[PDB]
Amino acid sequence: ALDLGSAEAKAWIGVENPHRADVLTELRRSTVARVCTGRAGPRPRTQALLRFLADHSRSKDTVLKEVPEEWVKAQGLLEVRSEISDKNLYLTRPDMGRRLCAEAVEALKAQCVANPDVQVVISDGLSTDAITVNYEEILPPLMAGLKQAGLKVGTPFFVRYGRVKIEDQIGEILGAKVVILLVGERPGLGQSESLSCYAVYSPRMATTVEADRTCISNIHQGGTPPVEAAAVIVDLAKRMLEQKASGINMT
Amino acid sequence: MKLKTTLFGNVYQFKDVKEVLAKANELRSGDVLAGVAAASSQERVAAKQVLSEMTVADIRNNPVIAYEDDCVTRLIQDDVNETAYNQIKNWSISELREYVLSDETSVDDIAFTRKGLTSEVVAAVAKICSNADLIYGAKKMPVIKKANTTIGIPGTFSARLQPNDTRDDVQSIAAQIYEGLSFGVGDAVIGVNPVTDDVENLSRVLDTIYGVIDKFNIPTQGCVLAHVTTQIEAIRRGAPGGLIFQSICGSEKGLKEFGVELAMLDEARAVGAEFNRIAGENCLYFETGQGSALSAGANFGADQVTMEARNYGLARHYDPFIVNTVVGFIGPEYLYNDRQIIRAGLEDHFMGKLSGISMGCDCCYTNHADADQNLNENLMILLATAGCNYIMGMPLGDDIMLNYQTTAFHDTATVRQLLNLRPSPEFERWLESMGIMANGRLTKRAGDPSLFF
Amino acid sequence: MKLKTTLFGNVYQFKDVKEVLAKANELRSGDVLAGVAAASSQERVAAKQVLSEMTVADIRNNPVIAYEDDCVTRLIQDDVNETAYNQIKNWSISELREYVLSDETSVDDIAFTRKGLTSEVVAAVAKICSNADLIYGAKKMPVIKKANTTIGIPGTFSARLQPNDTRDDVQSIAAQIYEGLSFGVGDAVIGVNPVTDDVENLSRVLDTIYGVIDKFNIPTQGCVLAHVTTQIEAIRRGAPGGLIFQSICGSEKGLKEFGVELAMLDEARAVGAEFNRIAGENCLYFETGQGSALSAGANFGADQVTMEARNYGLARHYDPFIVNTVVGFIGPEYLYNDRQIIRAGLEDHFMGKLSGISMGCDCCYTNHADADQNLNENLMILLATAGCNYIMGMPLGDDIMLNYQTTAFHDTATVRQLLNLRPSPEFERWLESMGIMANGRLTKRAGDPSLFF
Amino acid sequence: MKLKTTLFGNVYQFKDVKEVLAKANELRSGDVLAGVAAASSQERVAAKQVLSEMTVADIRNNPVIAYEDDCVTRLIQDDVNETAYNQIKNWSISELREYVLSDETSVDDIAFTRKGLTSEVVAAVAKICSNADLIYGAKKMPVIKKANTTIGIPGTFSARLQPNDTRDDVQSIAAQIYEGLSFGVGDAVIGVNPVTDDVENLSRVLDTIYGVIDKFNIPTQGCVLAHVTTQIEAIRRGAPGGLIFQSICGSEKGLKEFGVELAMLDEARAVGAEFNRIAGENCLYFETGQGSALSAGANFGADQVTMEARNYGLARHYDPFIVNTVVGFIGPEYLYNDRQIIRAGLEDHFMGKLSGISMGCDCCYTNHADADQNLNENLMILLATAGCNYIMGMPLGDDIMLNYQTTAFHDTATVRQLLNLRPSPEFERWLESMGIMANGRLTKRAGDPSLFF
């Protein structure tokens, strides 16, 4: 009896007649990669191919699942969306995911701080569960850190169907000197929790290049933990305000 | 040149050379997203036919971006051998196709012909090419380079050991390296995609790779695929240099998006020459992929095939050890399903081989795309027949950090044992002396990373 | 034996083996139209795991069609070597897959092991195989037969000349035979799908084929793929006998759909032994393909993978010279697109080789299916690397008669020179004397049928 | 670092490294005329021992001409791989000699090690080598380059066709080209030392050379060895470009003597990339020879061995297709007799291969030196066994123009058949189709230039 989603299934050593089977167990726990599963001639073994395909069955599901509108408000958040209406057209038209709708661009200025000095933005990007699993752990303690001492903290807000370049708009609409974006990366095979931050100083839609951002990736319980991530982001925010530059052009 | 053709008595008019190349492409979701695609399968064949009767000059004189405005267009055009150009300037794109495909065309015939070409001309040939034309034609155009392994020798097949990690943890990275070596993977490069971008993390990963390299005296080379500036400063500060990588794009606005100047590519050559532990003469490593110039708004109405071919005319200027496309690295907006991704694999490799660069391919797909692991095995084997110089390698193909799936370590062993191909001869000698390989085949004890202990 | 498993905390239960055999399949439109397909990826995976954990005996003692009711079940179960079966009866399908794939398993080890399987067991293994598993697994299972040429030796690649005319006009048929011979096609067979079914027509077609054969002393054999009872009669009557063809289905009711009793096949074997102009011992030719039992309403809730496997276990009894699936011959209701025509052409070939038959494949598609000719070029190459014994050939693969696209005469020549493979040694010897082929490559004067004039 | 040693109880002291580099030399009339030669055998030996005991760093940090003063010192010191240098910097010349000679050193080991040397270090090793040391040491250091032919592969032997006329009459030049081709000469290059220096003359000479090349589709390349600035101009102007030649000296003042700046060489590289009819990547051709800096008064107290080494370290920067010393070209004031022309032709070749350049040798002598043609036949064979990449050819080696004797067209044919060596594979393929060569030997109809008529 085997559950391919089980820890014991993921802790499975397929190597037959190993040189050092203890060494195998130390390499299997030293990583989350599917090491040490052995071979059948030049091919994978059956169970490892089974746990691969099962893990792929799960990962495909996470792609199109959305975060509730009820979850966003139970977090007390302004929810706005891009020009994309649903999850399908989002996956195929990056140009509308980088742009806010019309009722978007007015709820921004009506409901949020004018010319903040940090604007924190949260979007689902390419994975909902990157947002739900790590929120309560990253967003609260983040928000405290910028308030001490800083810093005209912009009120946070969620962008549905959001892409990384849409923060160039937000940085202008709001006039924020610095923009932070917690966004879902594309789903991995073994997990979809991975979160990233894209942070840019005084963004421009006309002028800002992709190089001008600072990126922190693999914020999750297997990568950078969200508590420590939050402490690293505000410090990053503290430095872009000192240097008045972001990403590539920082020291 | 005509921009006009009659097909079933129907007139099809095209505005410029840029439109013809775009619409001559087989259907892919990126061109659709770029608004350059043909609207009918009848319009698409019309673009093929008018393209087929255009000459070399027509396309050499009509880059999708103008000379004055683009330093990549300048590099491509400035590097043309003009004697080799004048010989073929009046050939149709139909005749260049037939010339490439001919078995009366030797590799030394192509060696000179290809210097008269530009990347737009390279892409032109590719669009009037079936999947089999792309495989056979790329096969008779080997490109052989050497670092401390030789790559591209017909009858060989290399593999990059790609050990990535969510925290750049070096005990995790090292675990995947013993895994890779155990399957004969690594003769291309032991390259790590970093999750950070600071020198100190970069140099710590390099120490881990080269510590493994030094301990067993492996003939190969390490790389950390950070930005090229961070690799240069890490090597200047004393970390072991192997290959020097930079992701590239086929236009100046495409490069800017990345933060790259050509002078950094000129500097990476000089830094490698002064610092890098490379016995041979090729040290640089570039990666490409369709849809990167449109992702930056930096394609200027051109299609993603023409723009990917310019990636190659650029990289040929710096004569790198290895280039490869990450064929479905990005997502379904640019390449949708199996069909399109296989097709892109065959195009990118063929154009790279027609460009005189050491063309490999990351046979990959993302989880939000209409594909699975059987797609990778389809195209991995199609490219091995075409003499693809190298593929990637990860345990079962699962990148725990890049959150895509590439080829397994098992797949390089399968290809080699299936097609009777060897690794790099320098590297193959090492696996023999390590008991990993005998007569191109994995030994019974192979596939066990606990073997190095 | 379990029919259930837990995947991600949810219990997945199945009713019988027939269902576990069905839902484990990769997704095709055929198992959807048959109601046997899985509901999702997860239950597909769940079906593979329960299937991987069932033993040989589990699947051998559970034929999709009962013994007492189906004379193909009878034939398969009756031809089992019970000594080979009892050695393996308690292996799970997951160990049989790893045994077939092991580089420690020899061709001679498989030669005895396959004697203890039943067709349903062959299908089971195929179900839990990746596409590389299917290619590499089949490559290490060569099946060699002999007629007037030798087919199936590793390092060779055969092709059948398919000269089909809309009127069986013997000038149209002659013309394409001269075209194909000029590319090196015809070592598998020169085989004609007739537009009629009358004896005086076949004799006409056979006397045309064999006039060319006799004139250029071609080492090969002819065929007109009418019903077997007409073939038998035309040869008993004085037409030249080469191979004797018949299409087959994997159930008694499927054979009745075609007009076929197993006594007709015994008769073909006996007509061949008294009449046919065959030097070797193998003279029969069957064709198969996923979706024929479902069309005939003769599948009985079993999926088209398992039913196709019963085809090979039936064919293996008559030791034919050649068998080939017609992978995309019927249309999209059974296999919709590129993904499914490839995956099935890999499943089929792998299954045929495990059953021990000289398994080729008609790599093809129809115009109402989601496919094009780049699909034929992808599949022929992948199946070539799997050691597929032969593919078809037509001018550009355009069947002017059966209204589908197969592979060109160019395409066999391409595979042979891409993969450095040769024809049947006898056919190769003849092409070399005719100046068409030197060193496995086409001469300059090759591909020109007016060479025979 | 010691500059002194005790030999037979007598102390031998030296002033600097430049002197120890000088007196260690084998006796030649050139170091006598330069005042740098040892007083006797004992101090010669004493110089070798102190030299053998100095480290790489000792000699690398002591260039005969200072960095700030000489742009060839600059070029040599600047192209050092400091990573390869720091591995070896503390090896004594006596361990570098034993490393180069060791059968445990591979071609790939040397490929990295030579990156950390400077030309003076190359000379040091050459100084403490026997003549067998020089031959066997160079043999295990092949240098392979490609143009329109491949030169330098072990088991091959190239030769340059030298058709020099006292008026650059194009019938005299044509006639000897037909003579040489008939012996298998010309795979290195068909190269002309012009009696003039005007553009309209070279074009005439080049259009004559290339008329034969184009008529018989000869795989090779042409050259007229005028000054590089005239060559550049004649090709920018429409004459066919093959190789671009320039003589070179091992000091800035030596290059000025010739009229050469390093910018002219960069320009030749760039003219070749836009104009020349070369399939490969190597198109430059330099010539060297002991005694050119001393003639130019541009040696600065350094001996002709060390200064000649700076030639190769300069050439290595431009990666030329071929380099050859002209060993006995000037006269007896630098090398007097047979003993010295051999020893220097062995030193030169060895030094060129250690520096990594495609090192040939014009085995030759002058009529006012103490030598005859048996000296050319001794040296060509010894240098052949050392794997010398090419020698010259003239009818009986009689230069009707430059008034020295080189090697005959017979002599390349002799070496190839004595040592069972072949031409460049491409040139060999052409000679075989012309019936001039079968199995590396001349046919019966070979050696007869009227064969081309």
Ligand code: B12
């Ligand atoms: C896909 C991807 C890319 C794609 C982006 C194409 C696309 N439109 O999807 C391509 C191939 C162009 C790419 C390029 C590079 N990437 Co990248 N990339 C990723 C990846 C795998 C996924 C990103 C994602 O899913 N984002 C979420 C979605 C919803 O956002 P999106 O708006 O759809 O995507 C945008 C951003 O992802 C951004 N982007 C992508 N990569 C990078 C890297 C940096 C430094 C920045 C600022 C932005 C950026 O560009 C996209 C379009 O605007 C991540 C790995 C990961 N775990 O996330 C790395 C990653 C972010 N990339 C990284 C690197 C190093 C690079 C390069 C600098 C490599 C190089 N040596 O040149 C380049 C240049 C980036 C640039 N200057 O724009 C590192 C970042 C390390 C760090 N601490 O900053 C990561 C973490 C992993 C890696 N090693 O590749 N990348």
Ligand SMILES: C[C@H]1O[C@@H](n2cnc3c(N)ncnc32)[C@H](O)[C@@H]1O
């Ligand atoms: C896997 C690594 O390869 C690089 N990479 C992936 N796709 C492309 C592309 N289309 N162009 C350039 N670089 C790319 C990214 O930088 C990533 O980090």
Ligand SMILES: C[C@H]1O[C@@H](n2cnc3c(N)ncnc32)[C@H](O)[C@@H]1O
């Ligand atoms: C093209 C020829 O091949 C045979 N053929 C095609 N598809 C199948 C199948 N699934 N089963 C059996 N025979 C088939 C038919 O007999 C036809 O005449």
Ligand SMILES: C[C@H]1O[C@@H](n2cnc3c(N)ncnc32)[C@H](O)[C@@H]1O
């Ligand atoms: C015979 C041809 O070779 C060249 N040549 C001959 N000897 C030398 C030397 N020591 N250095 C450089 N070039 C030389 C001259 O350029 C001449 O033209």
